[PDB]
């Protein structure tokens, strides 16, 4: 029932994601010199360094907010891919499966802890 435990759990999960070769295209903001029309397709860029920085700044109140930004990295990749068989999009699908697998208990434990606090 530790209401604050999600934060270090999220830090450790971001460390695992950064060690994963599949996170390479998502570790930093998409390069606009490389993809000049990126902002014509994507309204809200997101990447794992921005997520880690937001977390370390104390700018996430809950793991649900962190989860919304991580899922935005994957939906941006799906929206920008020219094909569902592209290398970067294929890496995003594997990384998203790995993330969802690990974030589920973080979300469950936090929501359980908050319900106990308001019991
Ligand atoms: O690497 C993030 C930029 N991007 C390229 C494709 Br394909 C989808 N998103």
Curated annotation (Swiss-Prot):
Modified residues (Phosphothreonine): 44
Residue ranges constituting the Bromo domain according to the UniProt record: 1-106
Compartment(s): Nucleus
Tissue specificity comment: Expressed in myeloma and epidermoid carcinoma cell lines.
Superkingdom in the source lineage: Eukaryota
Phosphoserine, modified sites: 90
Coiled-coil ranges (or none): none
Assembly description: Interacts with IRS1 and IRS2. Interacts (via bromo domain) with acetylated lysine residues on histone H1.4, histone H3 and H4 (in vitro).
Disease linkage: Chung-Jansen syndrome: An autosomal dominant disorder characterized by developmental delay, intellectual disability, autistic features, anxiety, hypotonia, obesity, and dysmorphic features.
Function: Probable regulator of the insulin and insulin-like growth factor signaling pathways. Stimulates cell proliferation through regulation of cyclin transcription and has an anti-apoptotic activity through AKT1 phosphorylation and activation. Plays a role in the regulation of cell morphology and cytoskeletal organization.
Protein name as annotated: PH-interacting protein
Native source organism of the sequence: Homo sapiens
Species classification: Eukaryota, Metazoa, Chordata, Craniata, Vertebrata
Gene field: PHIP
């Amino acid at each position: 029932y530790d209401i604050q435990a999600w934060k270090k759990q999220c830090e450790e999960l971001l460390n695992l994601i950064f060690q994963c070769e599949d996170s390479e295209p998502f570790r930093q903001p998409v390069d606009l010199l490389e993809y000049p029309d990126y902002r014509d397709i994507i309204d809200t860029p997101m990447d794992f360094a921005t997520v880690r920085e937001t977390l370390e700044a104390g700018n996430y109140e809950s793991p649900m907010e962190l989860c919304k930004d991580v899922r935005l990295i994957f939906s941006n990749s799906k929206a920008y891919t020219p094909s569902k068989r592209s290398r970067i999009y294929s890496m995003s699908l594997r990384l998203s499966a790995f993330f969802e697998e690990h974030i589920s208990s973080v979300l469950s434990d936090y929501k359980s802890a908050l319900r106990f606090h308001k019991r």
